[PDB]
Design a protein around this motif. Sequence first.
Motif, PDB file in Angstrom:
ATOM      1  N   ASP A 206       0.696  -1.236  -0.214  1.00 14.82           N
ATOM      2  CA  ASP A 206       0.039   0.085   0.129  1.00 14.82           C
ATOM      3  C   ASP A 206       0.941   1.426  -0.117  1.00 14.82           C
ATOM      4  N   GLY A 207       1.892   1.244  -0.742  1.00 20.30           N
ATOM      5  CA  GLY A 207       2.853   2.345  -0.690  1.00 20.30           C
ATOM      6  C   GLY A 207       3.850   2.473   0.036  1.00 20.30           C
ATOM      7  N   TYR A 208       4.039   1.505   0.906  1.00 25.11           N
ATOM      8  CA  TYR A 208       5.023   1.476   2.050  1.00 25.11           C
ATOM      9  C   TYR A 208       6.306   0.598   1.654  1.00 25.11           C
ATOM     10  N   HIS A 209       7.351   1.228   1.616  1.00 23.58           N
ATOM     11  CA  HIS A 209       8.519   0.725   1.218  1.00 23.58           C
ATOM     12  C   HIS A 209       9.186  -0.286   2.341  1.00 23.58           C
ATOM     13  N   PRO A 210       9.107  -1.604   1.973  1.00 22.79           N
ATOM     14  CA  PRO A 210       9.575  -2.209   3.103  1.00 22.79           C
ATOM     15  C   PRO A 210      11.306  -2.348   3.404  1.00 22.79           C
ATOM     16  N   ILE A 211      11.747  -1.994   2.310  1.00 19.48           N
ATOM     17  CA  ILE A 211      13.109  -1.866   2.327  1.00 19.48           C
ATOM     18  C   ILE A 211      13.795  -0.440   3.066  1.00 19.48           C
ATOM     19  N   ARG A 212      13.174   0.510   2.614  1.00 18.60           N
ATOM     20  CA  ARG A 212      13.442   1.788   3.112  1.00 18.60           C
ATOM     21  C   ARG A 212      12.863   2.170   4.414  1.00 18.60           C
ATOM     22  N   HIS A 213      11.599   1.254   4.864  1.00 21.87           N
ATOM     23  CA  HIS A 213      10.753   1.823   5.768  1.00 21.87           C
ATOM     24  C   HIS A 213      10.125   3.383   5.688  1.00 21.87           C
ATOM     25  N   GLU A 214       9.502   3.559   4.724  1.00 20.72           N
ATOM     26  CA  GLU A 214       8.954   4.959   4.627  1.00 20.72           C
ATOM     27  C   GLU A 214       7.596   4.634   3.664  1.00 20.72           C
ATOM     28  N   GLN A 215       6.579   5.631   4.121  1.00 25.69           N
ATOM     29  CA  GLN A 215       5.558   5.564   2.999  1.00 25.69           C
ATOM     30  C   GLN A 215       5.957   6.376   1.791  1.00 25.69           C
ATOM     31  N   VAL A 216       6.055   5.966   0.782  1.00 22.82           N
ATOM     32  CA  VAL A 216       6.440   6.685  -0.347  1.00 22.82           C
ATOM     33  C   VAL A 216       5.587   6.790  -1.545  1.00 22.82           C
ATOM     34  N   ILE A 217       4.259   6.159  -1.423  1.00 21.77           N
ATOM     35  CA  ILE A 217       3.200   6.488  -2.197  1.00 21.77           C
ATOM     36  C   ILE A 217       2.006   6.524  -1.153  1.00 21.77           C
ATOM     37  N   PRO A 218       1.048   7.605  -1.384  1.00 19.34           N
ATOM     38  CA  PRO A 218      -0.015   7.266  -0.554  1.00 19.34           C
ATOM     39  C   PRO A 218      -0.900   6.249  -0.588  1.00 19.34           C
ATOM     40  N   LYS A 219      -1.419   5.622   0.618  1.00 18.50           N
ATOM     41  CA  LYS A 219      -2.169   4.392   0.418  1.00 18.50           C
ATOM     42  C   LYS A 219      -3.175   4.473  -0.478  1.00 18.50           C
ATOM     43  N   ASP A 220      -3.936   5.445  -0.589  1.00 17.95           N
ATOM     44  CA  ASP A 220      -5.026   5.296  -1.624  1.00 17.95           C
ATOM     45  C   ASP A 220      -4.587   5.459  -3.155  1.00 17.95           C
ATOM     46  N   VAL A 221      -3.554   5.963  -3.267  1.00 22.42           N
ATOM     47  CA  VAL A 221      -2.963   5.892  -4.522  1.00 22.42           C
ATOM     48  C   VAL A 221      -2.530   4.604  -4.962  1.00 22.42           C
ATOM     49  N   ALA A 222      -2.015   3.970  -4.175  1.00 19.26           N
ATOM     50  CA  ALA A 222      -1.500   2.565  -4.246  1.00 19.26           C
ATOM     51  C   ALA A 222      -2.733   1.615  -4.704  1.00 19.26           C
ATOM     52  N   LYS A 223      -3.697   1.772  -3.771  1.00 19.04           N
ATOM     53  CA  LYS A 223      -5.022   0.997  -3.989  1.00 19.04           C
ATOM     54  C   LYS A 223      -5.590   1.336  -5.336  1.00 19.04           C
ATOM     55  N   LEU A 224      -5.661   2.413  -5.726  1.00 20.85           N
ATOM     56  CA  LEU A 224      -6.148   2.850  -6.935  1.00 20.85           C
ATOM     57  C   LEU A 224      -5.323   2.114  -8.402  1.00 20.85           C
ATOM     58  N   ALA A 225      -4.026   2.199  -8.062  1.00 25.25           N
ATOM     59  CA  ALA A 225      -3.101   1.756  -8.868  1.00 25.25           C
ATOM     60  C   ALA A 225      -3.221   0.208  -9.088  1.00 25.25           C
ATOM     61  N   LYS A 226      -3.449  -0.565  -8.205  1.00 26.66           N
ATOM     62  CA  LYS A 226      -3.748  -1.899  -8.207  1.00 26.66           C
ATOM     63  C   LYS A 226      -4.877  -2.224  -8.790  1.00 26.66           C
ATOM     64  N   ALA A 227      -5.986  -1.579  -8.473  1.00 28.69           N
ATOM     65  CA  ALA A 227      -7.393  -1.553  -9.054  1.00 28.69           C
ATOM     66  C   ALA A 227      -7.253  -1.686 -10.592  1.00 28.69           C
ATOM     67  N   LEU A 228      -6.541  -0.685 -10.915  1.00 28.06           N
ATOM     68  CA  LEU A 228      -6.254  -0.514 -12.526  1.00 28.06           C
ATOM     69  C   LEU A 228      -5.529  -1.567 -13.177  1.00 28.06           C
ATOM     70  N   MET A 229      -4.573  -2.091 -12.404  1.00 24.71           N
ATOM     71  CA  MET A 229      -3.626  -3.287 -12.817  1.00 24.71           C
ATOM     72  C   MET A 229      -4.615  -4.387 -12.834  1.00 24.71           C
ATOM     73  N   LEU A 230      -5.557  -5.133 -11.885  1.00 18.38           N
ATOM     74  CA  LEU A 230      -6.408  -6.064 -11.579  1.00 18.38           C
ATOM     75  C   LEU A 230      -7.485  -5.869 -12.846  1.00 18.38           C
ATOM     76  N   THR A 231      -8.048  -4.548 -13.054  1.00 22.91           N
ATOM     77  CA  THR A 231      -9.098  -4.384 -14.194  1.00 22.91           C
ATOM     78  C   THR A 231      -8.659  -4.077 -15.564  1.00 22.91           C
ATOM     79  N   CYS A 232      -7.495  -3.578 -15.752  1.00 19.89           N
ATOM     80  CA  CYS A 232      -7.138  -2.683 -17.072  1.00 19.89           C
ATOM     81  C   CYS A 232      -5.524  -3.237 -17.375  1.00 19.89           C
ATOM     82  N   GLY A 233      -5.108  -3.817 -16.483  1.00 16.17           N
ATOM     83  CA  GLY A 233      -3.399  -3.939 -16.642  1.00 16.17           C
ATOM     84  C   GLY A 233      -3.073  -4.899 -17.791  1.00 16.17           C
ATOM     85  N   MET A 234      -3.907  -5.897 -18.317  1.00 17.87           N
ATOM     86  CA  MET A 234      -3.293  -6.968 -19.325  1.00 17.87           C
ATOM     87  C   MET A 234      -4.123  -6.720 -20.405  1.00 17.87           C
TER      88      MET A 234
END
Lengths: 306, 303
Positions: A206-234
Amino acid sequence: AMKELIKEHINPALQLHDWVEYYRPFAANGQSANYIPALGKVNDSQLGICVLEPDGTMIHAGDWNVSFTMQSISKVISFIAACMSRGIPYVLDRVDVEPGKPFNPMINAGALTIASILPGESAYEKLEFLYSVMETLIGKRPRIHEEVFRSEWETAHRNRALAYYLKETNFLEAEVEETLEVYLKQCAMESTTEDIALIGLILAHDGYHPIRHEQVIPKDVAKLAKALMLTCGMYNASGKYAAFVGVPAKSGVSGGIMALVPPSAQPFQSGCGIGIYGPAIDEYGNSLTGGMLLKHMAQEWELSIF
Amino acid sequence: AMKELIKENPALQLHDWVEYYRPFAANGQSANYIPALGKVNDSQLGICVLEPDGTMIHAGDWNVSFTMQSISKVISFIAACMSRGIPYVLDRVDVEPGKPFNPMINAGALTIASILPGESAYEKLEFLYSVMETLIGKRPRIHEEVFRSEWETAHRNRALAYYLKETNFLEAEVEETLEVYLKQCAMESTTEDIALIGLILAHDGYHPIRHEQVIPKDVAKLAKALMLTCGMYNASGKYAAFVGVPAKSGVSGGIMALVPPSQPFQSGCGIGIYGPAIDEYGNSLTGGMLLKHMAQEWELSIF
Ligand SMILES: N=NCC(=O)CC[C@H](N)C(=O)O
Ligand SMILES: N=NCC(=O)CC[C@H](N)C(=O)O
């Protein structure tokens, strides 16, 4: 027979190797991208994969470390960058999230609208914004494959047609040539399976960088991105991926697939980012052998979000 | 003041959110095009949530009977898969949001009706109703009035049905297919029955109350994919992006949704929602607002 191999002793790395070697030959049933002459050079039988875990564990197999241009996978990053810059509501007034009128950010028309609304008073500034976002994700300034860029630039009639259409209908917030440049340059950004596996992992968290330990993308943007990958990505196989693989995923014509699995209740129970590369593409525009690898992993490891 | 109320939890939450969202039903209307439907109290809003341990939470008009409408599409799709097998079904119908059409849309749903096993409308519907009994535990009531008002005015569906017949996608006769499709649509439900079907899908076709596998797992996953991608008409992408649960709407104001095992509802749940006032996309207005609220508050997104 003094020299041989060792007879041995569950194991994802071993499985990935066996699977890359089994799915590699199927490339003879697909083609390398034609409408970009630079991508027609590439060797078809290539197949690589990188799976990355939040604890830093990375497994890979095949041609996992060969460079390629992101192509449409970059539509996800520019879309993310535009939401971060302009906010979700502004972006969604100009672009549709459904699989004149706005167009979906995962298709060329919506992606061109997106490039045009990046912040900056020139193509150079829009691109520096996009590279600064890219660098917070992968930790480095991305390389433009200029060979690929220039050959896209000289033959980009269809994208110029669309861009002028979008300017006519008042869905481009920048000049056409400026927009083409930004769009064609993100498409030519280079990566390996490793880089896309990392962006995948970040989105999975959800936008959290588990290597750097930072929020790098807002959660709601990440959600939105994944929804588009699931629905329109292929492209025109997104429904089929959702039904038979069930993992958010984004392909490009060079043969990349970025996929991800969010934390869920072995293996990869904390989630993972996936980077696949297989330049032989099918009729839908998706990596042929890469798509087969991903479907196998998803079915074998039960990765489906459904 | 000798008499009063009490000075001060998903159940409390659900009550408060129903009272909050109910007034917004003034911004839509109930379905006009089915005349027997455009006659229901527009301001109704109800919800049932079902956990696999048996626990049920409901608020509002949760026990008001309504027609399934497009929700029935998921059942007949599932029924066609169980009878014919997935490969046969996906030759005649597309899973993408002559050419085959999507089973969540009228044209795909007519094709599905036509492939249900049986040589007449009565035999096709009999298999359907019996599949429905294994899910909800009773044979379903058909709203004969809704059926015969839809049957008299079903020009668009007859146009489509004859188009599919011309292009070779109907495995039955037109009037027969239309009868099956219009009756499935008029099967009656409360928020509870659709919450139960949603719970079962969340468990991959496993009936967690009965303890047996009622839908095969691959069928159940395919139904879920179809809901997430096509289930909310032309708002499915928006629901995916801001709600994130597989959901299916009907124009009578029903929404069936579900959350797979992944607090609250860590074991998963089925959700049945009813809100007759619908929006421009054809989905419950206040039911959709309720669902978006719950999903955001309790972090239900499967993303
Ligand atoms: N996945 N995509 C790349 C594009 O759509 C760019 C088109 C290509 N550069 C051309 O205009 O020849
Ligand atoms: N949710 N519904 C789709 C329908 O097609 C309902 C059928 C309608 N009663 C008709 O007039 O044919």
